[PDB]
Design a binder for this molecule. Sequence first.
Ligand SMILES: [Cl-]
Ligand SMILES: [Cl-]
Ligand code: NA
Ligand code: NA
Lengths: 275, 274, 274, 275
Amino acid sequence: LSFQDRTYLVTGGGSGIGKGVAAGLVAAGASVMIVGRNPDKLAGAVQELEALGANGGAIRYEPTDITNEDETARAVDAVTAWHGRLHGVVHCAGGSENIGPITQVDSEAWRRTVDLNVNGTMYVLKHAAREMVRGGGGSFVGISSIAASNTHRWFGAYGVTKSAVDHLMQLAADELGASWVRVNSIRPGLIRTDLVAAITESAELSSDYAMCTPLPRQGEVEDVANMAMFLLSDAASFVTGQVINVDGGQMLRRGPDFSAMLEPVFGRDALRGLV
Amino acid sequence: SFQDRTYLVTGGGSGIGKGVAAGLVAAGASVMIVGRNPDKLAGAVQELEALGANGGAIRYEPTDITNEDETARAVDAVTAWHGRLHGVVHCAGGSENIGPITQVDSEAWRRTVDLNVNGTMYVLKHAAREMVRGGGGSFVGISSIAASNTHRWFGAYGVTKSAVDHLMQLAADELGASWVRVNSIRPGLIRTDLVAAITESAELSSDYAMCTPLPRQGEVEDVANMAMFLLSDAASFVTGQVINVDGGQMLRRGPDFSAMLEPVFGRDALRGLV
Amino acid sequence: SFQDRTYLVTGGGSGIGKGVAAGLVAAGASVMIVGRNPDKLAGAVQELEALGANGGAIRYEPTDITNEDETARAVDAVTAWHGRLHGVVHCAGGSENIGPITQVDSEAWRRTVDLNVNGTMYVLKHAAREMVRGGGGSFVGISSIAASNTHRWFGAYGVTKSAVDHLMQLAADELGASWVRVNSIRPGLIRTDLVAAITESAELSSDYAMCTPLPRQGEVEDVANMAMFLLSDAASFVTGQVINVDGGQMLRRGPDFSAMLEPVFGRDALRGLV
Amino acid sequence: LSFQDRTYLVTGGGSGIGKGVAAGLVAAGASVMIVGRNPDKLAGAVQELEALGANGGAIRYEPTDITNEDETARAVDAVTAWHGRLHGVVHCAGGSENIGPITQVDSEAWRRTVDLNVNGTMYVLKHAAREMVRGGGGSFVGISSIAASNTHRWFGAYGVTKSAVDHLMQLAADELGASWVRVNSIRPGLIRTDLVAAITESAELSSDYAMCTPLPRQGEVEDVANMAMFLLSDAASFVTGQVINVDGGQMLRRGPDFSAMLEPVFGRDALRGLV
Ligand SMILES: [Cl-]
Ligand SMILES: [Cl-]
Ligand code: NA
Ligand code: NA
């Protein structure tokens, strides 16, 4: 239940979900290192997060392009060297550059998404895992997506790669349980971030998501932060290998239909293939 | 978020249910435990009263969940206690026989079905009515790893718990519009009185440990922690989930009770020969 | 691989069961159809006899699968016909009521449970006994997309069919050592007499089509084709599978019967208000 | 039920499963193009496959490195131009170069596996799909693995990438159903090929697989070929988006434990992380 005097690494800690997770931990008295691509945002987030955690919290940043393994490895060394032990990780770094039919998918955009999500995650887990095993245990939380649990027509590499990441969390849980390192995935549904204010505020797509979602609201960053913190905590010490949706129940229905956005740009025939 | 709230816990007289009740009482909640054995329910109350005051309170009503009318009466009693029912943790259920599918004791199978499938439906049906009228709540059904991974020779148990998990998800679909969340927890091997048979066997104990990534057995607190989280406002966007608390055993397989069952049935019987 | 073999088909008097029976007869198999309605079973026999000779043959026995003794008697009859039972396609089952979980007709729910959970177990239990003694076989259980994707307001149907799918997998685990394969098929919307309500509604018909990647409704032949493949030696390394034949509807969602149910129950009732 | 006068593309058609699938189709009277990396094997397989299909069958090859999209696109043009229509695809090309703990995984080997399985599959599906949509429909069958359905400790990228591929088949099925293009995945268990005679014939690993497998035998290439042919055929014309194991029921138990092979090479501590 407590996080005081524990140290965590948070990737994509500069905005959206990662920032919320970092906020939560620092406010609970944890030491956090946030890593991400943009030193501007990272620095900004740090001065802000520092206001929280008058409760013993601490915050640091290291700019890191997680598609380069050396940079990931260095960041993991630094967070571990901070107090000597790395208690956990929340991996929120990851992206999506594709939107369109599989038959016309931009292969460079696809390959970038694979590198970021699949390889990026592997580097973070590989190196974080080494220290958590040496430290006598810990908890790794991967942030996936409902795109992995429910097909999102025209999202190309997003759900494909997030499915890989979910499998990698389960594989690692299997391998690392003997070392008391728990590994779990969270798949958020529609969460309100500045990143996705186009969708959340659009009449057609907000309406489609709402019809797919049993609970009558959209998600919030705090919803995902709460699950991550629970899974990092000792209250989940027998929970590993799980893949858990924080999505208002959307996985019980279907992924969203982005027709209304895409039909005027691609035409209906392209959306069922047909080049 | 437990302090000013009231919860129903079925099967609250021992094991998982009792742990859940104890955690909620400790947090300041009011809890009504119900179950078949009045001696055990009354004893659990006396024990849990010791968890005293964050202002928590505990009551019991003997209830046979195979009887819909008694179940509805229990739901009326918990609801009238402070005027609103905030959540349910449904731990009542079990099974009565290990053996090959070809030798299933049909009356025991029917009993397990009645208890697990029908009993869960009645609790859900009437708890949902009140949680809808009251403006929302959280229903947690306790299932088992027997539903997620085949347990050879467990017959009705895994079958009925899979039915229950589907019910939890169907109910989440139907009830989300009324702010009633419904989730399932599947425990792995949890240390209780009900598990002394696995405990006394080197073969069975070893088999579970080999099937379990984390190098320990589960505790009732582990399941109680998950249940409380899912009841809390910290899980307010979580519904329709089926979540294992099992040390990662679902990543491997169900246990193999061959060592125990071979001397009773014979090897041929365990692959269906009569 | 059907020519010199004998199969039991439950619910063989109409719909999916009858299609399955017809395909097997056409291929030269002997088929016993069983079911509750003797007029319909007898009429199906007369029809299927027309499928004549690749040397195929068809018989019927009226059987109430909620009675284990009648079920065992049907399994004895099919087995004694040519001395070995090679497989089963279990299509008998159904449901009796659409409505919110908060207004479930408990007697109809129990009936659906008895028919689907208990009835399937009896057929499986006794068919498995003979298929084990005979040196192997293939058991195909027919389930439904209601088990793979929540169908709001379908109550016991999806719940019980999920129980059935778990049973198929448990039985595959137990019985593989005796070369008895057990698999489940989940059909989507299939064109039969049982679906005229969806057919007559623009709203419901449109909703299914929107939920279905392939731009057509399912046919009984589609399900019969899958069943035959799974019975065949071409599927000899396939067991424990649960396979949809649904035009890809499982990739989207279950149907939304709101248009039909709103005028009966009201909108508030459909989210659990009583 | 028939395959006469239909044309199919088979990737990895030069050995193992692909060769068996190609054999099956040609023998049933189909035209097949087999593609793969090694022109020696491809040519060999063609002269052999030509003996079969006195029943109207036809066989061709094009050497193709499926990690290069241009080469994949050319092969798809050629098979389609052959008779004017491409009726289906069975995608068996794919590999696995990793064996060891996630904490010590060779990142170059990992990245190669991702490129082959994830990107390779996408290229094949993208371009094959274009023609099948234009042709009025068809059937794409992806060959995955039980490594995707059940965690295989120490298999690193194999199950991770095969999980991605399964998701991609489901996404494509969702997108392309409107065009009558069905897309499905097969996950084989232990299949006897020359590739894996080390495992299938080893006492410890054969024994472990056998205990995990309800049916008392190992798989055969014909078992997978039969499922693929059924899914290509009109007898499966309402079957799309499915992910189907041909594994003797192994998915009901667990993936294999390669401890006996790996412990003497890595030590027990490395196998639970600990570098
Ligand atoms: Cl009790
Ligand atoms: Cl009938
Ligand atoms: Na209180
Ligand atoms: Na015959």
